[PDB]
Structure formats: structure tokens, C-alpha cells
Amino acid sequence: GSWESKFAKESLTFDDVLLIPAQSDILPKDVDLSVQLSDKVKLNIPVISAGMDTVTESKMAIAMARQGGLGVIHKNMGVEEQADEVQKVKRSGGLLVAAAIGISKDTDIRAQKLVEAGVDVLVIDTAHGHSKGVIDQVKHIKKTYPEITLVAGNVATAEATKDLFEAGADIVKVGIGPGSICTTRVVAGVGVPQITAIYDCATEARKHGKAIIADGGIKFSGDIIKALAAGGHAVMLGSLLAGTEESPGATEIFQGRQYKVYRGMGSLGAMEKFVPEGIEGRTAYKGALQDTIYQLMGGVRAGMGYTGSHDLRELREEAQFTRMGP
Amino acid sequence: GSWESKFAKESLTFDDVLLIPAQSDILPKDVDLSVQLSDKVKLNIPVISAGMDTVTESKMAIAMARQGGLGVIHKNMGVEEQADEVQKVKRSGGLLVAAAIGISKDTDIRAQKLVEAGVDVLVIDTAHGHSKGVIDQVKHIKKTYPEITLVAGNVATAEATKDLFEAGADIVKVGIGPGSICTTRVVAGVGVPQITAIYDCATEARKHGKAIIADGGIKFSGDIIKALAAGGHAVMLGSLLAGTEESPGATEIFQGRQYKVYRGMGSLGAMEKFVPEGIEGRTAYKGALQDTIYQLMGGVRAGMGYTGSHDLRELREEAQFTRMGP
Amino acid sequence: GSWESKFAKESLTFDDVLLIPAQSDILPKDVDLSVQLSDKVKLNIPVISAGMDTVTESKMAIAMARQGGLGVIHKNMGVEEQADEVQKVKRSGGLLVAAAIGISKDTDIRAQKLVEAGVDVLVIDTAHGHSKGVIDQVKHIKKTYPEITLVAGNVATAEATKDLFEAGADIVKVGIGPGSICTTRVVAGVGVPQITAIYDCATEARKHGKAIIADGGIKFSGDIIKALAAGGHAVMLGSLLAGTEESPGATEIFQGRQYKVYRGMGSLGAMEKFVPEGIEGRTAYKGALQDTIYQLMGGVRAGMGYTGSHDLRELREEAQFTRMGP
Amino acid sequence: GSWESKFAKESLTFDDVLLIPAQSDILPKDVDLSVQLSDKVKLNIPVISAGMDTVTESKMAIAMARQGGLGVIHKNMGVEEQADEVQKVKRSGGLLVAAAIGISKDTDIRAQKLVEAGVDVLVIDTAHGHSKGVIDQVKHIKKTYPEITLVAGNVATAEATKDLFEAGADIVKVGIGPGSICTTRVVAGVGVPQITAIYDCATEARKHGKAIIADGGIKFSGDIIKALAAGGHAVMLGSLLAGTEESPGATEIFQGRQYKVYRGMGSLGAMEKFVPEGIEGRTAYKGALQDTIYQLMGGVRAGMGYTGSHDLRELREEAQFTRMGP
Numbered sequence A, B, C, D: 001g002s003w004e005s006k007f008a009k010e011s012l013t014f015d016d017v018l019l020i021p022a023q024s025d026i027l028p029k030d031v032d033l034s035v036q037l038s039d040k041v042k043l044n045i046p047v048i049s050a051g052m053d054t055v056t057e058s059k060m061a062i063a064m065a066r067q068g069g070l071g072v073i074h075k076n077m078g079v080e081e082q083a084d085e086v087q088k089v090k091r092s093g094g095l096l097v098a099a100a101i102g103i104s105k106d107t108d109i110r111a112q113k114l115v116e117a118g119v120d121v122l123v124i125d126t127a128h129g130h131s132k133g134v135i136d137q138v139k140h141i142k143k144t145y146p147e148i149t150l151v152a153g154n155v156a157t158a159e160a161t162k163d164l165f166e167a168g169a170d171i172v173k174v175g176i177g178p179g180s181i182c183t184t185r186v187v188a189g190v191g192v193p194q195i196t197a198i199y200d201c202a203t204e205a206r207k208h209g210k211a212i213i214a215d216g217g218i219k220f221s222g223d224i225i226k227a228l229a230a231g232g233h234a235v236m237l238g239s240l241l242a243g244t245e246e247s248p249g250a251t252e253i254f255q256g257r258q259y260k261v262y263r264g265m266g267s268l269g270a271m272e273k274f275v276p277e278g279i280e281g282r283t284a285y286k287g288a289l290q291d292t293i294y295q296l297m298g299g300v301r302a303g304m305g306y307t308g309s310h311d312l313r314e315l316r317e318e319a320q321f322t323r324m325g326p
């Protein structure tokens, strides 16, 4: 029974695996990085910036969209200000833009002002996507605005991925506890190692023909290709893009060294009652986004040249990994 | 035979596992933390403070009982003083209180003075609960005072859990070597990793319908829910509650930093011949108990919201874990 | 299918294994270190110096060849200078010498000038040997100069080892990501732990009767015998021979301590567009090559005395390993 | 075949395992520590001091024999001096004493002078006991002096344990690479994790009814009981007894802290050609042997009280271990 299967499951993280080099015809410089998330949304690079207050505002989204990616404007501000941020991205060349929403009372009026501004996709940003309140809210958003692409999360199982897709989600966001600034593992004793989480969820998504977002735990370009090869359609970066000038955080100095503050959306500072699930820290100033993305995509291109993956579909469906010890 | 099975067993600790997020209807703020340990004892929070000289005296027990928990008054004092501590807790609003006893000569007269004072539960606090001296003493206490709830330990196997319940114990205390201040693993080469110890013992307890106490190795709130989900009815905390003002230890200062001394009951200082099995250290001053318990229970509530565990019975019987590497 | 086998493979590195001591008749001082790589090439010690700009030039190759080994002159210089280096080794007593080549336009004219000078073996030094450009180039070199021994790489699978041997390679170079100065694992998320890589490739080579070069990740003499016992015919050392005086790097001083610069062939400095796959560092000055090789071969001789391996063929075919945790 | 079984074996070290607490009738203070090694040799404690130049001379052997143990006088001195050391131990109350011998020319004359002095047991101290030179020497010693107990080693497999017992050894010494001061794993790439080495060898010894010596890798009292429970009849300590005043090393001071030098018998200093397999270091002054042995045996007694092992035979044959991660 359920008592007997308590400890049956085994899971993997990024550090547990490596990609096996395979037959290659295509050079890194020529591989296809493009990915179709929904019928209306398609990106040139499989990178989305995080719906965080130390990561994405109009500046991040504009720079992300220019490099061939996407940006999710965070919900930790006024309803009026979030609507104003969406307009700025659209007026900057008719670029793709995303915004975050909750499950509370303010959601219904927040969702209308974001769509009005010209948003392409709405993100139901929750700590626990497999909740009754989330399921109902997913149904409501798609019944009110069926023309706007809906992203729902966060989840870490096939069952949770099934339910959200059945409720009305176009894209499911995968990630329970892998984030650099996350303490959910330590505070709630909950989590599913990201490589397995992506794999179990992508196994379900393949049965619906829908997209999954590999969200959190990415430290380097090598973790981008690992996340994508495990089944992820696109990656969500928080820590790697919070040091760039384009992030809302103000540039500071400490002992002649430049730093930008990066905090979790569940840390004391961001929440300004729930017990904190995130921490507040400091990350080194990286400079222009363009340089960070060029370094990260160069690593992904290199790995796709190693695996012989001409596009992301060939990486997601054919690339093989090997398991190793510490 | 026994030679062939020498190395067959595999065991898990807290760091080896994480709880899998499941379908949730209930919010963390509304989950039930209450647990029925025996017919006479029932707590509002599944937390019991340790029967230690740097952890529990009347002050700890009173603060623990007020927050919805329990406190075990240590036996490392005079027979008269231990009886006086029990009276103080009862006179503080008719609160639930526990006390520790050994297997020596002084036990018989110590047990009578504690019951007289108004104690609810007697704890046979031993290093090795699967001893002949403990088995006999469990039978004697229940034959002399059958009206008082008996807790016996410590054990780490189903066989040891079976024997104590058969001898006369109401609740079995699980923990051989997991304690932060414990050196039994290093000194005696003995121990059973706590997650497996709780699981093997709770597998036995389910066949008797009796309660198990997950004792030791808890570092954070995440380890509380892990211990409970593995089969534990309630958790015993030593290290996490020794820094609070309510603990008997005197507040000291070192390099402008406040500290409270926390030592094992088998360290040189506490024993004041047996070879030491515990160490003497220093832990940072945490402040009021109320704040520590609010932080710890908030983490448990959060995890129960993740696993969709409306109460502790649904956590103990249905919650699933995943295994992961370091 | 391919989705189901994504995470089936398990691989081992040097630290995961140790050699089992077996029946011994021969003393370390008397064991045979000689190995036949091709019909024309045979070494007295199974050590080859790396085709790197901080490891091998004529000085290294001469010292290596005198000790009974080989040296691969790097391609990170002018076509004229590389041809001049080969002549110096041949004029130093008619010693065995090797040189590196790519897959670009300059290769065709570079290969002719190296053979003219009197080179014994040509090395197609690539990051990814299982590429179309490498396969074609392997065929071309053997069709133009069939009299010169051809080494091709780098690879990490049996399939890649099969293809190169079928294309025209005499010796296959094994190593994708194990190098001390390598960041391919971190940047590209690609690699195969060296012990398994050598084993899977040597399993294939045994079906062709051809030689494999265990390239990279060797930190000590113990890793030399492990690499050879896993199937390797000879070892390629970069880090262990870059500190010696014979290496092209200029001797420097920092805080009264002597150091020699050692960098990857895929680091920013060596490449002077591709994203860097290697790093630039500093290694302690080791002194004369002779002393380093005497220490390393003494360790291999000792291990061959432990395993009872009278020669390298008895080590490669009969030596057994044990797996262990960290 | 042999190629296919290359990586089949899995081995365990001390840190991988812990002893499972079992039914106990006996108290630690009353457990039997005595062990019969041969017909003529029997000790009160299962501890033997190492045949090392920084561990045992007459002073160590006398103190060891008084506490109920044994001491092995090292062979790294003059033939005359080693004979003089044996006499001193015998004149100190007719105590049990052991001495070390090699496989070289000086052995034949060294063995005669040691027996003359009144030695009880001769130890063929080798790095690799599964050598032809050792096998022949084992036969010769038992054919010349059959009245003296013969100890032979070092080995790490059942096959090597079989051969030495068949050649004429009474006791087989188990340990290839576990020693604190050992670098054989790093230098020769050879070794068998000590827990498995003891187990595979003791499995063989049980088929001959002969004794095995668990030699090396013991850091604490917990590793003593683990070594014995895995199959070892007695333990050999080097590092744990080199800090005591009784060890031949001279007491020194560094930054107001007392230290005693402890080096491997295969380090540069002791060897004063073979490549070094051991290192030279410094260990904190421990004081009187009596205090060190009382702390170590108190830990073993405690563990025997946990496992319910009334004697060493019940520990060796019935005690069960559990495996755990790092």
C-alpha cells in the first residue's frame, strides 16, 4: 500500500547527470535555439526571465525580448504599475511580454488591466500549483480571456501536470524547491530534484502535446541544456540574470566590489502570516544582459554540437544522459 | 545465515529524503497539528521538549504546554527537586507535564514522588531501551502505577519496539545515535539512521495501535514533518529549544554574542565509570520559546499544505518521500 | 524507446574505483612498461605528453622520448614553426615524435610540412571527434599519407570509437570532459566519467585489434594504472607535466614560490567566436621531467606488483577493480 | 569473462556502516574482551600495537601486554637491537611479545635471534602478502621454528587468506591501503576498503578455523568494534597509539602545543629504490597508554552492550550492520 511505497521513489538533480556526446553533423554556431511554447508564443532562444522583484520589470523584458527570449513582470507592486510595465515593452517594437498573477481577490482586476495593456501570456505564479485554489483560478482565466496564453505552476509531478493541463493551462511551470534562493526544502521538507521533476512532468506533457517550463536551480549554461534535454521546452532564470544592469535592483558597492541584491519572492523583504520560504542575498554585478545571454547560449550551442542536436525537439526527444556519483 | 546477512540492511537519514508535493485542498494556516499519544494524553502541536539538563525544567514545560506541547523534566537532579518541578507546571493552569526516570535503585522512590505531584506521563529515559533491566522496569512501573501513561526508550528496531509494547509501554521512544550532541556512532560504532529507525518502529507500532516518539536529529522544521511523515506521532527536540530563554541554562556572552550552553546527558558535565557518549557545546540565544515554535510549526503547516495533509494521521499514512544523493 | 532510456546509463570516474591486489610473481622493479600502439610506434613507458601550448614543444618531446615516452607538438603556432619543432626531436638521436592537426583549411598544408620534417604520428586534435568534419578528415589523412600513424579524437563511446577506426584511425583518443583544466562539463553539460569512457571505448577497440589513448583526468600515478587497467594502452598527461622545466611555459615567482602557467587549449588565452571550454591557471614548478616520470612510473610499477601484472596486456585484460563510495 | 567482471565488485569502509542495536542481557562493564588468536597466544583485550618505528619498541609492548594486549617490535633497526627489545618485555613479568620480519637475506638470522630472546609470535610484515617471496618465507619459518606462532600479511582477499593459511600461517593480517598514513591508494591505485577486506578474509578464515588481524584505518573506538564485528579477531592500531608517551618517538613542542611524530613504514624517513607509499606527519601527545586504552575499550564495551555481544565470538558471528550514505 501507501505505507510500503513511502521510500520507493529515487530522484536526480543537475549535478547527478551529464549528457552523452553523440554523432554530430551540425556546428554549434548553426544549431536552432527556437521553441514554440503555444500557438501564439514562439521564442528565438529557450530562455525566460523570472517573475521576481530583483529580476524582471520592463527593462529586463525589453532586453530579453530583443535577444530572442521573454520576461515575466512580477506581481509584487501596484495593479496600476504592473499594467504600465506591459505597455512599455509593447511600445518598444511590438515585443513578446508576460506577467504574473496570484489566486487572491486582486487577481480578477489585475488580469484585466494586463490584457488591456497588450500582454501575450498570463502566469499563475504560485508556490504550490497542485492546490484547489489554483485549479479553479486556471479554469476562470481561460474562461474569461481564452485568447491569452496561460502558464500555470509551480508543480513537480505528472499528476499535478495532468490536472493543470485539464483545468485550462497551455504551459505548465516545473519547479518545487530547486531555486538557488529557495529554502522550501529546509523549511517545509518538500521538494523534487529538478532533473526528475522536469522528466516526470514532460512525460505527462507529451500525452497532451503541451509545453513545460523548467523553472529554477540553473547555475550555468550546462544546466540549461540538461534541463531542456530532460524534457523542458524553455528555461526560467532568476539568479543568472539578477546581476545584469537590466534587473530592477539598484547597483551598490562593498569593499570596492559591485553587487546587485537578489532575493526570493517568499523572503521577508518581498512579502512586505506566512513563514519565510526564501532568503535575501547579494550577487556580483554582471553588466549587460546581452553578454550574459551570449555566454549562456554559447554553452547550449556547444552542448547541442556535442549531442548532435540540430534543434530543441531532437535534444528533448533523443539526447541521452549518464548518471555519476559526487 | 547471520554471517551472510551482516551487510544486507540499508538505512536513510533526514538529508537523504524529501516529501513529494501532492493534491491540496487545505491551506497551511488551517491544517490540524493535534495528536493523541495515549488515552489520557493529547497535544495541540506534535512537539515534546527533551528530558535534558540544558533543555527542560518547569519553565520549559510551562511554555511548551502553553503553546500546545509537552515538556519532560530531566532526572539529573535531586529526587525532591524533580517532584517540586512537576507541582509548578500543574499550579500554572493544570497543564500536561512529563518526567524522566532510570532503571537504578533510586527509580522506585523517584516514580512515587513524581506521580504524587500530579505528573501525567513517566519516561524511562535510557541509552539502550532493548536491555533486560529496562524490560523489567517497564513491567514494574505499569504494575505499580497503571493510571500513569508510560513512555519507554530509546530503541531503533521493530523487535525492540515490539518487546517494550509487550512489556507495558504505551509510547515507544525512537532514536539510537541521531542526536546533534550524540557521539554514540563514533564511540560505540552503533546507530540506525533516524528516518529508517522511525519507519521500522512505526511499522511495528501500527500492529499494536500504539504511539512512537521520533527522538533526535531534527535540525529544522523540515526535519519535523519528515520525522512525522516517516511514522512518528510526535517529535522530541533538544538542540532547537536549548537556545530559548525558557531553558535552564544561564545566558552568557562571548565576543559581544549571546550564547546558551547545550550538552548531552552522556557528556562528562552531565554525568557529574561510563565512557562519555555525548559532548558539551554552546548554542546561540534564540529568545522566547513562542517565537521558535511559531517558526517551526509554520514550516510544518507549510509542508502539510504541500503534501495535502489535513492532519498528522494523513501525513503518517499517505505522504510519499523521494530519495536523492548528496 | 529513447525517452525511456534517457537516464539508464551509470558511469565511473577514477575516485570511484581501486585495483584489487592479486597473486604476484614479479617485483615492481622488473615489470614490463612497454606498449605497441601501432605497427610503427612502440614506447618503453605508456606515457604521452599532451598536445598543449603549456605542455609540449621540442624540449618536452625530446625529454619524453629519452625517458621512453612520446610528445605531441601543439598546433597553436605558425605552420613553419611546428615543422621546425619536429626536425629538432629527430636530430636529437632519431627519437619518436608526434604532432597535432585540426579540420580547418590550414590542415592540408600543415600535415605535409610535419611529415616532411620526419614525424612518426599525426594527431587529429578535436574537442568532438564524433563530428562529420573529423570523420572526413580522418579518411583524407590516411588516403594522402598512409605510411604515417594516425591518432584521432576525442571520443567517449563505443559507437564513436567504431566510426573513427572504420574511417581510417590507427589509435582512438578517449576523453570528453575529464581534464583538470576542462570546463566542458560546466559550460556544455556534456561528458562521460573517464573510467567508463576508457572501458566502453576499449570494449570496441578489442573488436578491431586497435589502440586507445586514455586522455585526461589523471592527477597521480594511481590514476595512470587505473586508466591503463580500465583498457587504455597509453596515458596522456597535461597537468602532471606542465610544471616541469621542459614545458614551453616561462618560470615565474609569486610570494617566494616558483610557478609555471598551465591553461586549456579552449581557454581565452590559447584561442588568441567560440565560447571558452577551458580555464587559465598556475601550477607549482616540478623541476626536471626525469624526476616526475620516475615518481609516476614507480607508482605504476608498484601497482603492477600489487595486481601481479607482468606487463600492460595482463593489466588491461585481467586486472579487477572494486567500486566504493566517497 | 575477466573483462566483463572488471567493475562487478562493491566494497565498504568504516564510515559506510553502523552496528544495529540488539537484545541485551549483559552490561558494558561485564562483557568479555578476551580472544584466542592461536593455541599458544591469548589476549585480555583484542588490541595489538603496530610493527612501526613511531609506534612499538619494548616500552609500548610492556604497557600493551600489561593492559591485556600485545606489541609488535618493528624491524627498522639493527638485528642485535631487535633481539635486545624482546628480552626486556620477557624480563618485565613474563609478558606476551611479538616481532616483525621481512623476506630478504637478513630475515633467516633475524628470526633466530628473536626466538632465542623468548618471542611468542613472529610477524612477516610485508606491503603485499600475496607475493611468491612471502609464500615461500611463510613455509620456511614454520619449517624452521614450528613452536612459534606465525602471523603473515598484509592481504585483502579470500584467495590471499587461503594461500597464506595453506603455506603455514597461523594468523592472517588484513589491510591493503586503509592506514591513516598510507598513500598506496594514491600512489599504486590499489586497495580494498577495510570493512569488506576484513569480511572477505574472515569468510575464508572460518573455513580453516584460523585467526585474522584487522589491520589499519581505525580512527576511534567505534571503528574497533566495527572491525571486530566484520570478522576480525583482534585490531592493529598505529595512529591511535603513536601519541602516547610509551611510543619510541621523542616528545616535541610547536606553538605551545605538545606533539609526537608518526610516520608510515614506507615513508622516506623510515626507508633510510622503492617509490614512497607512506607519509611523515605529527600527532598530538596523548599521555599514558593506559588512559588511551581505557577510553577505546570503554567504547567497545559500550557497543557490545548495544549489540548484546557477551563476548567477541558473539560479535563476530551474530552482530548485524546497516549501510548508509555520506
Ligand SMILES: C[C@@H](Oc1ccc2ncc3c(c2c1)CCOC3)c1cncc(-c2nc(Cl)c[nH]2)c1
Pocket: A126, A127, A128, A131, A154, A175, A176, A177, A178, A182, A184, A265, A266, A267, A274, A275, A276, A277, A278, B024, B028, B301, B302, B303, B305, B306
Ligand atoms: C512564503 C512563500 O514562498 C514562496 C514564494 C514564491 C515561490 N515561488 C516559486 C516556488 C516556491 C515559492 C515559495 C516554493 C516551491 O518552489 C517554487 C509562499 C507564498 N505563498 C504560498 C506559500 C505556500 N503554499 C503552500 Cl501549500 C505552502 N506554502 C508560500
Ligand SMILES: C[C@@H](Oc1ccc2ncc3c(c2c1)CCOC3)c1cncc(-c2nc(Cl)c[nH]2)c1
Pocket: B126, B127, B128, B131, B154, B175, B176, B177, B178, B182, B184, B265, B266, B267, B274, B275, B276, B277, B278, D024, D028, D301, D302, D303, D305, D306
Ligand atoms: C554515557 C551515557 O550516554 C547516553 C546518555 C543519554 C542518552 N540518551 C539518549 C540516547 C543515547 C544516550 C547515551 C545514546 C543512543 O541514542 C539515544 C550512557 C548512560 N547510560 C548507559 C549507557 C550505555 N548503555 C549501553 Cl548498553 C551502552 N552505553 C550510556
Ligand SMILES: C[C@@H](Oc1ccc2ncc3c(c2c1)CCOC3)c1cncc(-c2nc(Cl)c[nH]2)c1
Pocket: A024, A028, A301, A302, A303, A305, A306, C126, C127, C128, C131, C154, C175, C176, C177, C178, C182, C184, C265, C266, C267, C274, C275, C276, C277, C278
Ligand atoms: C573552446 C574549445 O574547447 C576545447 C579545446 C580543446 C579541447 N581538447 C580536448 C577536449 C576538449 C576540448 C575543448 C573538450 C572535451 O574533452 C576533450 C573548442 C574548440 N573547438 C571546438 C569546440 C566544440 N566543438 C563542439 Cl561540437 C562543441 N565545442 C570547442
Ligand SMILES: C[C@@H](Oc1ccc2ncc3c(c2c1)CCOC3)c1cncc(-c2nc(Cl)c[nH]2)c1
Pocket: C024, C028, C301, C302, C303, C305, C306, D126, D127, D128, D131, D154, D175, D176, D177, D178, D182, D184, D265, D266, D267, D274, D275, D276, D277, D278
Ligand atoms: C614503500 C613501502 O611501502 C609500504 C611499507 C609498509 C607497509 N605496511 C603495510 C601496508 C602497506 C605498506 C607499504 C601498503 C598496503 O597496506 C598495508 C614498500 C615496501 N616494500 C614493498 C613494497 C611494495 N611491494 C609491492 Cl608488490 C608493491 N610495493 C612497498
Ligand SMILES: O=c1[nH]cnc2c1ncn2[C@@H]1O[C@H](COP(=O)(O)O)[C@@H](O)[C@H]1O
Pocket: A050, A051, A052, A154, A175, A177, A178, A179, A180, A181, A182, A183, A184, A215, A216, A217, A218, A236, A237, A238, A239, A240, A263, A264, A265, A266, A267, A277, A278, A279
Ligand atoms: O522565495 C522563494 N522560495 C522558493 N522558490 C522561489 C522563491 N522565489 C522564487 N522562487 C523560484 O526560484 C526560481 C529562480 O531560480 P534560480 O535561477 O535557481 O534562482 C523562480 O523562477 C521561482 O520559481
Ligand SMILES: O=c1[nH]cnc2c1ncn2[C@@H]1O[C@H](COP(=O)(O)O)[C@@H](O)[C@H]1O
Pocket: B050, B051, B052, B154, B175, B177, B178, B179, B180, B181, B182, B183, B184, B215, B216, B217, B218, B236, B237, B238, B239, B240, B263, B264, B265, B266, B267, B277, B278, B279
Ligand atoms: O549524551 C548523549 N548521547 C547521545 N544521545 C543523547 C545524549 N543526550 C541526549 N541524547 C538524545 O539526543 C536527543 C536530542 O536530540 P537533538 O535535538 O538532535 O539534539 C535527546 O532527546 C536524547 O534522546
Ligand SMILES: O=c1[nH]cnc2c1ncn2[C@@H]1O[C@H](COP(=O)(O)O)[C@@H](O)[C@H]1O
Pocket: C050, C051, C052, C154, C175, C177, C178, C179, C180, C181, C182, C183, C184, C215, C216, C217, C218, C236, C237, C238, C239, C240, C263, C264, C265, C266, C267, C277, C278, C279
Ligand atoms: O580547454 C580545454 N577544454 C577541455 N579539455 C581540454 C582543454 N585543453 C585540453 N584539454 C584536454 O585535457 C587533457 C589534459 O588532461 P589533464 O592531465 O587532466 O590536465 C588534454 O590532453 C586534452 O585532451
Ligand SMILES: O=c1[nH]cnc2c1ncn2[C@@H]1O[C@H](COP(=O)(O)O)[C@@H](O)[C@H]1O
Pocket: D050, D051, D052, D154, D175, D177, D178, D179, D180, D181, D182, D183, D184, D215, D216, D217, D218, D236, D237, D238, D239, D240, D263, D264, D265, D266, D267, D277, D278, D279
Ligand atoms: O607507509 C606505509 N604505507 C601503507 N601502509 C602502512 C605504512 N606503514 C604502515 N602501514 C600500515 O598501516 C597500519 C597503521 O594503521 P592506522 O592505525 O590507520 O594508522 C600499520 O599497522 C600497517 O599495516
